[model samples]
Target: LLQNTVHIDLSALNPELVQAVQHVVIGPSSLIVHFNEVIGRGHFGCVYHGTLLDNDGKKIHCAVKSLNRITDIGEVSQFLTEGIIMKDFSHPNVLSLLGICLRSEGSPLVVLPYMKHGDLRNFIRNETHNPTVKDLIGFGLQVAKGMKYLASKKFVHRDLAARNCMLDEKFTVKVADFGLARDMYDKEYYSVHNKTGAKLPVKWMALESLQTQKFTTKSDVWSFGVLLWELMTRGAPPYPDVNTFDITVYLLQGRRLLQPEYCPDPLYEVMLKCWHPKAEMRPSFSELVSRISAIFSTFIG
Candidate 1:
């Protein structure tokens, strides 16, 4: 049986290990948790708005992602894998892991820094104040930078979307939701599917992914393009009138989303490049950052 208690200590570790462990203090008795309110729920788990006290006795606001059930070993393993991956990531624009709660009963909870503004999609849709063009571009750039950092670590974010990007109190964007992410080795792509053939996020997928179920960094770029469109449209659903099942056929017919209203031509050009049928034709996250940065400079000045 897996141990019910897991505590991480970093004092005796190297610099790299220290960075990953400094924020995460895990143990059954190490935390004082209060579940405040339910924030979001999905197939994998439920997220709650909560608060916890650190070793120093200071209270910190956090989001606790807890599984709906403690059913299978595979599910537990996957959840732990997410925490391991997130612990290694130390980017400002990437979601940070606070720790994990492993108990003798019920589902384990993964702790994360709470973002006051919530997910990017909802934030964009609910903003009563109009965001400047610079604000829009800045959000995209932040995501691009986060993705670039992941790419640098040879990590492929198989599921990148506007909904997965979170916003802080300052409205800064941070890439979240690592459930579908995997570390890419020598292969350029990773293939995935559910046993029951349940639907996937087709509209944000690249042509190869839709056809072969193969996901690469380029596929993530494709999703980033859709994310840019979402930002531009202030949270309009991708493929507005098309059903999810019809998306593959729609793209097969060479149909792509039209330029979003009020979106700049240059930014739209980048989006088109991301949708290129050949994965090799897509720009790398680094290139996307540079391109977006150039656009920002041209406009913000």
Candidate 2:
């Protein structure tokens, strides 16, 4: 019953798949999965931070993402996609999918690595403490490393925003949430069945993604542009109160996010590289890594 989002049918899942999702919730430090606390709510699911005790009674802290059955099909499909993507991808920056609880009653749950420092969104939006340039560059390097790896593997991370990036106690960026992600080579979608015109935060998505549903590696580069801006600005929301469509119009008209005083010159240039109009002209992940690495090196020296 999450609101402010559109719902899609998931009736395509076979009965076996439906049954497989039952009893997925493994709960709060006991044999039974009890409610700990609602961590956050999504369009179809709610996340909870809980603990699972192993045989020795040692507790493993985890973040559980739970989604209600009988919801929108599109949302369920996206969740299933995330499950598949997470199961296959094992990277340091990506959140680890410990296990899934589909057999549990109430809803299907996905267990993930519990980040002590919360997500990058919080640090950028709510942080009151001043961070050093080295600190920011270090985090940016981690993100660039992860993105480069994904790009090398031909995985298109369609969604790359501050809210999707988690942070460790040391403020390292752990990229998570592959719900909008798609493998560039998957080409079996039924043309009639494919949903079109879906939109995300315009200020974060690239020009091509805004104009067409096509999300290429270059589009991801565009998103990385917004992310760089976010890191420089301490996680401010893109376009503030502007609607996605409006932001798209403005971007198409050659407007860019206003650079702030704190953003280093080199970082600003990197962002501009990402926002380049020609998708082919965008820098590869490796180049971005080297750029950030150079910046970090300069900071240390």
- Highest lDDT scorer: 1
Ten-residue stretch with the least lDDT total in model 2: 183-192
What digit string (tens of lDDT, one per residue) describes model 1 on residues 174-289? 99866322211111112233234544678899988988887889899999999998888888898878988899889888899999867888999999998998889999999999
Q: Pick the candidate with the highest TM-score.
A: 1
**Which ranges of candidate 2 are over 4 A from the true structure?**
1-36, 40-45, 54-58, 70-81, 104-106, 127-130, 179-199, 241-243
List candidate 1 stretches off by more than 4 Å. Answer: 1-25, 28-30, 40-45, 68-75, 180-196
Query: For residue 176, what is the lDDT in candidate 1?
Result: 83
- Indicate the worst ten consecutive residues by lDDT in candidate 1: 181-190
- Could you tell me the TM-score of candidate 2? 0.75
lDDT accuracy of residue 206 in candidate 1: 90
TM-score of each: 0.82, 0.75
For 118-149, candidate 2 gives per-residue lDDT tens digits of 66767766655566666766777888888887
User: For model 1, what is the error of residue 165's alpha carbon versus the real structure, in angstroms, after optimal superposition?
Assistant: 0.8
